[PDB]
């Protein structure tokens, strides 16, 4: 994602954990590639020493979404930055709002 300063590319899960833990701040976050599915990404959010990781995918229409619980209204975003902006807001269904970007 060339326009997403928090995108670290194909770093390992544990590398991402260590980058977030170095900040020591709940609400720190980054993006990295999925280790499991080509072209999927992981939004990684620090809270209380654990990295809450939300899989983010693009549709054939170009929109982006995060993995959502069964029965919950799933949200689609035109661009990654719009997903990020939405999840900066209080009380949106992730562990803590996205507050402290860990820039590559």
């Amino acid at each position: 994602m060339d326009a997403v300063a928090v995108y670290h590319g194909k770093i390992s899960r544990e590398t991402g954990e260590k980058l977030l833990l170095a900040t020591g701040l709940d609400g720190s976050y980054l993006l990295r590639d999925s280790e499991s599915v080509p072209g999927v990404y992981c939004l990684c959010v620090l809270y209380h020493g654990y990295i809450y990781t939300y899989r983010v995918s693009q549709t054939e229409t170009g929109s982006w979404s995060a993995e959502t619980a069964p029965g919950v209204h799933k949200r689609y975003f035109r661009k990654i930055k719009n997903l990020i902006s939405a999840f900066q807001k209080p009380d949106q269904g992730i562990v803590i709002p996205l507050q402290y970007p860990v820039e590559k």
Binding site: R13, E17, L21, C44, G49, Y50, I51, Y52, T53, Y54, R55, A66, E67, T68, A69, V72, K74, R75, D91, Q92, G93, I94, V95
Partner: peptide, 11 residues
């Protein structure tokens, strides 16, 4: 013993 918790959006 992983520090990563795969999670889903809840709202």
């Amino acid at each position: 013993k992983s520090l990563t918790i795969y999670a889903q959006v809840q709202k």
